[PDB]
């Protein structure tokens, strides 16, 4: 589980998907910064910076 202000969500499945960074780059980085101490950070980083 990862954190977003007051919601709690699975790290591999952020609500911004697809194109998290392309849609809103500022809020995507802020969300990633709030989850650095979390063990599932790299699962969140992978999903947020992935788009085709």
Partner 1 sequence: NFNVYKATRPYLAHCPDCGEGHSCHSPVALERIRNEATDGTLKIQVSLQIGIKTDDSHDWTKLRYMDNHMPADAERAGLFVRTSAPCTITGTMGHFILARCPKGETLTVGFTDSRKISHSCTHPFHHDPPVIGREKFHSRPQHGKELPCSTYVQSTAATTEEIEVHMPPDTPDRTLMSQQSGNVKITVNGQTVRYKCNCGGSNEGLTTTDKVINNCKVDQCHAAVTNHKKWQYNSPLVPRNAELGDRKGKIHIPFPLANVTCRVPKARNPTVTYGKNQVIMLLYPDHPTLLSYRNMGEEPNYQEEWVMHKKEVVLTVPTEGLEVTWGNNEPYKYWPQL
Please report, as ranges, the residues that interact with partner 1 according to CB under 8 A.
Answer: 21-22, 25-26, 28-29, 32-33, 36, 41-42, 45-46, 49-52
Residue 10 or 24: the one with the smaller Cβ distance to partner 1 is 24
Residue 9 or 21: the one with the smaller Cβ distance to partner 1 is 21
Q: Please tell me the distance from the alpha carbon of residue 33 to that of residue 6, in angstroms, as a whole number.
A: 15
Smallest distance from partner 1 to CB 3, Å: 14
Cβ burial, residue 48 (10 Å; 0-12/13-18/19+): buried
């Amino acid at each position: 589980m990862c954190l977003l202000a007051n919601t709690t969500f699975p790290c591999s499945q952020p609500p911004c998907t697809p194109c998290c960074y392309e849609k809103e780059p500022e809020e995507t980085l802020r969300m990633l910064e709030d989850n650095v101490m979390r063990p599932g950070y790299y699962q969140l980083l992978q999903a947020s910076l992935t788009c085709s």
